[PDB]
Every structure is written in structure tokens, then in C-alpha cells.
Amino acid sequence: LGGYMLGSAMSRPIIHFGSDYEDRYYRENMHRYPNQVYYRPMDEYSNQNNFVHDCVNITIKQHTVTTTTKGENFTETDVKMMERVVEQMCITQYERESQAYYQR
């Protein structure tokens, strides 16, 4: 875990799934959901979506695994839902730290 880092927090984003009900679905669960996302220090990774991709996957993982071991089976849809919301969160947390690189 401590080879990764958690950074700052934010409020939950808002992301349309193509179903006008699937969008509401996660809304009607959003009391919890992820609210912080896991990365590594800026070093070589430079991409847009591709920085986000692992950032998302590892956050999504840590937010699934423990929940699974509490008896809550997030389906494929529950997990894919989180991946979008974590994408926006990981852009935000990515960029927050790009600004701090420029600030040197």
C-alpha cells in the first residue's frame, strides 16, 4: 500500500451512463462510493486517460476488495460505475499535483 500514495479529497462527480436510470442508480447509492483515489508521485507517467487508467483500477480495486469481504458483491455494473466516477476524481487529483510540479 505505502508504495502508492493517497492525495487530497473532493466531492463526488456526476457522470451519465447512457441509461438515464443507470445514472440515477449510482446516485441512489452515492452516500458512500469512492471519495479518494490512489496514484504515485509524478516521475515518468505523463498521459491523460492513461495516467487515470491505473489510478482508477487500483482505487477501484481497494474500494471493491474490502467491501466484497464485508459480504457486498458489487456486480460488473457496480464496478464499471465506480470506474467512471473515479476517472473524473483521478483527473482532478492528477491535475492538482501537476499544478504543484509547475509551482517548483
Side-chain angles (χ1 to χ4, degrees):
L1 248 289
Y4 299 78
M5 237 63 54
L6 186 68
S8 31
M10 49 201 126
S11 246
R12 302 178 197 102
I14 292 297
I15 313 190
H16 320 307
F17 277 94
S19 168
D20 75 274
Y21 179 72
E22 287 181 19
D23 192 353
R24 283 170 188 289
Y25 194 97
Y26 105 81
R27 241 76 97 78
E28 302 233 68
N29 314 148
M30 80 135 57
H31 201 131
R32 50 245 284 149
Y33 253 48
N35 74 251
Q36 244 165 299
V37 317
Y38 266 96
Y39 66 126
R40 271 116 296 154
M42 281 267 267
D43 167 266
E44 210 245 304
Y45 275 99
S46 64
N47 247 289
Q48 250 61 235
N49 193 247
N50 238 332
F51 172 96
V52 220
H53 202 355
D54 191 84
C55 180
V56 170
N57 205 284
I58 277 57
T59 302
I60 295 279
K61 187 118 299 184
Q62 276 301 116
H63 226 88
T64 301
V65 178
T66 321
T67 312
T68 314
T69 49
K70 289 138 93 66
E72 185 59 55
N73 310 113
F74 289 142
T75 62
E76 182 121 85
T77 313
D78 294 276
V79 180
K80 49 158 165 162
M81 281 180 156
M82 314 223 252
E83 292 179 291
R84 256 124 298 264
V85 84
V86 189
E87 191 171 56
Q88 263 264 89
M89 287 143 63
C90 277
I91 277 76
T92 309
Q93 249 269 116
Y94 168 52
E95 281 285 37
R96 278 163 157 282
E97 296 282 88
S98 201
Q99 302 293 28
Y101 180 86
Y102 175 85
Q103 226 281 271
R104 290 120 77 90

